[PDB]
């Protein structure tokens, strides 16, 4: 599979500033060069310019262009990009390709919102609920098509911040989330494992990893850290494991804000995450 990097630098899906550097954060700690030294023949495509809504009306529907024709090319979109709102743009440009997109949501928070439920408006709380698709209607009906997956095909993995209108969708949406709790209790192997059973009837999955799902000592440079996250151990479990199963076929990494890192830290641990969901292997 032929590596498509997709950089992203949007920040006007939340307030703070800084997560539109995530991309330059990424690629500095050597992403290319690492999935080169790894086999892969990797193409960076560069940023997507950006100039609330509109620009992330505009901005998404390039971000699912790419995605779209890159998939086209059957070579594997890896977006990494500023905050989660891009992923209303990278679902919009996969999930046509596949008549039963599966989602693995890599993220402390369900990002379930609404701009009427949202208690902030900002819109990277709300891609997963738009997407499924309840939400703005010009977010929901992206490319032209809604919802773009199912809730029986997403599971949530990392969830701790999840309070009020969010937990009750879920229970009524019938979605798989594994909060901290199930983790703790199965370890982390259990999940995976239950999660790639769980995801068998897909045609596609897509891996959506918002950084803060992982422990702020791990992954320190995110706008909403939540304490009592995935270990880096824990995180390099699950992205081997997916691999060995080969269900990934998209994937995005999204939050890392150096502005508010500790010299490149969370950046560096996405770029480790990626060498390990694309095959690196300690042995
Ligand atoms: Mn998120
Ligand atoms: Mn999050």
Request: some cysteine; overall charge negative; hydrophobic content about 40%.
């Amino acid at each position: 599979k032929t590596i498509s990097v997709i950089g992203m630098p949007m920040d006007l899906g939340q307030a703070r500033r800084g997560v539109d550097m995530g991309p330059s954060a990424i690629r500095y700690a050597h992403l290319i060069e690492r999935l080169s030294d790894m086999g892969y023949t990797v193409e960076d495509l560069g940023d997507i310019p950006i100039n609330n809504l509109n620009s992330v009306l505009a901005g998404n529907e390039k971000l699912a262009q790419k995605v779209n024709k890159v998939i086209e090319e059957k070579k594997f979109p890896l977006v990494l990009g500023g905050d989660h709102s891009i992923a209303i743009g990278t679902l919009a440009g996969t999930a046509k390709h596949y008549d039963n997109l599966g989602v693995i949501w890599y993220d402390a928070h369900g990002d379930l919102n609404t701009l009427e439920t949202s208690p902030s408006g900002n819109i990277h709380g709300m891609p997963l609920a738009v997407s499924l698709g309840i939400g703005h209607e010009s977010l929901v009906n992206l490319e032209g098509y809604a919802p773009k997956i199912k809730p029986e095909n997403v599971v949530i993995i990392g969830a701790r911040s999840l309070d009020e209108g969010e937990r009750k969708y879920i229970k009524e949406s019938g979605m798989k989330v594994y909060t901290m709790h199930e983790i703790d209790r199965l370890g982390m192997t259990k999940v995976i494992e239950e999660t790639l059973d769980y995801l068998s009837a897909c045609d596609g999955v897509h891996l959506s990893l918002d950084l803060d799902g992982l422990d702020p000592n791990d992954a320190p440079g995110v706008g909403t850290p939540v304490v009592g996250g995935i270990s880096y151990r824990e995180s390099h479990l699950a992205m081997e494991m997916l691999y060995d199963a080969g269900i990934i076929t998209s994937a995005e990494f999204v939050e890392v804000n150096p502005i508010l890192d500790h010299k490149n830290k969370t950046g560096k641990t996405a770029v480790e995450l990626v060498e390990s969901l694309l095959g690196k292997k300690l042995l």
